[model samples]
Target: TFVVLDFETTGLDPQVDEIIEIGAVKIQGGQIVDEYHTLIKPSREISRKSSEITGITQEMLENKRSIEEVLPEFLGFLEDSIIVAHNANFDYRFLRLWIKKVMGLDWERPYIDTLALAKSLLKLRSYSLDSVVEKLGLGPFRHHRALDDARVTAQVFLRFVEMM
Candidate 1:
């Protein structure tokens, strides 16, 4: 089983920014079995660029639970599953930062990075998630939303697995 995950962040830096949204889908036996998604209230304002990219406005996150409040449940849902992401390092770094800072625990879950996989496995002019999805004929998808991107990553990963 694997958990394909994505995060929409306030910015790129894990040290200074925060994750505003988390989306994940569980794959077991080559099928998506369950999903988890949430909007997180960040301590800082969402930048205009982030808002434009992710379509997550300040209003959408105004009443959401903070990451500290949501971590436990998200971690529980992730228990022992191999994690997958488009750019695993970005999501994993943020998750690692928060897991240690908030929960005071170490996180060493194994992960599959589809971005890295695409780079190693496919010859493409562009390796962005949307570009990879389009190149592979993975179907229509919006670019930056967490859940949609996670779903697309999952499909992309499956195709890569089949290729192997």
Candidate 2:
């Protein structure tokens, strides 16, 4: 089983860029089985640059639950699923750290990286999500939010699998 995943954060640094959103879709036998998505109130205020990059704001998180509140549910949703991400190491590192801090357990999952797969399977000049999506004619959606990104990634990954 695979969980197509994406995350939006306050910044790029795992140490500082707390996960503000997490999105994933479970896949079994090449079909989507379940999905999970959530927005989390980060521990620290989002930087202006990070907010600009991700289009998430403090006000958006004002009423949202904190990571401590939402992470356990998210982790449970991911249990026993192989994780898939475009740039998975980036997302996985942060998740592993946060899961350990919030849930007191290491996040362990088999993972696949679509970006790396694309590099090997597709003859594309660029493999960025937007670039690959454009090249492959996948339609647009909310770009930065974790849910939309994960959905887009799932589409991209499915297309790659079909081609392979």
Candidate 3:
């Protein structure tokens, strides 16, 4: 099984930034078996630019649990499944740091970067998730929101699997 994952964050710097939203789909033999999605309260305000991109604001996360509170459940949802992400390392790095920071452990699961996979497999000029999505004819998807982006990424990954 592969868990397709996505995170909407405060900014580009993983260590300094915070993940505001998390979304994932668990796929078993190309069929989605389960899903997980959540909003996480960060210690700081979200920027207008990030709010615009993700439609996630500081207010939206007010009632949400902090990542420290949520990581256990998220880890359970992810238990033993290989991870798949559009740009895996972006999410992967944030997770690695936080898991170690919070739980005093490392993320050891294998993960596949769909961005790298697409670049090597296709001859497209640009390889952003949406651009590759467009080239593959996979979606008229809602971009940026964690779950929506993750669902599209899951589709994009399966398409790559079919091609391979």
Candidate 4:
């Protein structure tokens, strides 16, 4: 199975930034079957700029489970599935670190970066999610939310897969 994933973070640094949201879909034989989504509370406070960017606030993090609690469940949902993401490296690297730090488990999985794929397969000026999705007529939703972004990325990826 291929797990299409996306994450919302407190900031850009994987070492410093914390994952606030996770969204993934289980895809088998090119079809989406199951989906998983969660919002996690970071151990540290999120910056005002980061909150402005992602629309995830300190209030939202309150009463939510921490990253340590969330990563295990997300990993369980992932199982041994291959990963797919728009910028796979960003999400994958953070997730790998989260799993390692929180569970002391190494998570090394194969992934397809749809941003790279779209750049190679389609003759586009830029390969950002907004540009590509707009060119392909795939998304009208906002980007910061995990589930909606993941679903949109999956749809955009399916279009790229068709071109290949």
> Which pairs, if any, clash in model 2?
none
Clashing pairs in 4: none
What's the number of clashes in each of the models? 0, 0, 0, 0
What TM-score fits each model?
Answer: 0.82, 0.79, 0.83, 0.82
Per-residue CA lDDT of candidate 4, range 87-106, in tens? 77888898888888888887
Estimate, for each residue in 5-100, the C-alpha lDDT of model 2 and write its tens digit. Answer: 999988777676699988889999989889898888887888889779888888888899999988878877877887899977889888899888
Least accurate 10 contiguous residues by lDDT in model 2:
135-144
Which rank order by TM-score, best down to worst? 3, 1, 4, 2
TM-score of 3: 0.83
Off by over 4 Å in 4: 141-164
- Which pairs of residues have clashing backbones in candidate 1? none
Q: Rank the candidates by lDDT, best first.
A: 1, 3, 4, 2
lDDT of 3: 0.89
Worst 10 residues of 3 by lDDT: 139-148
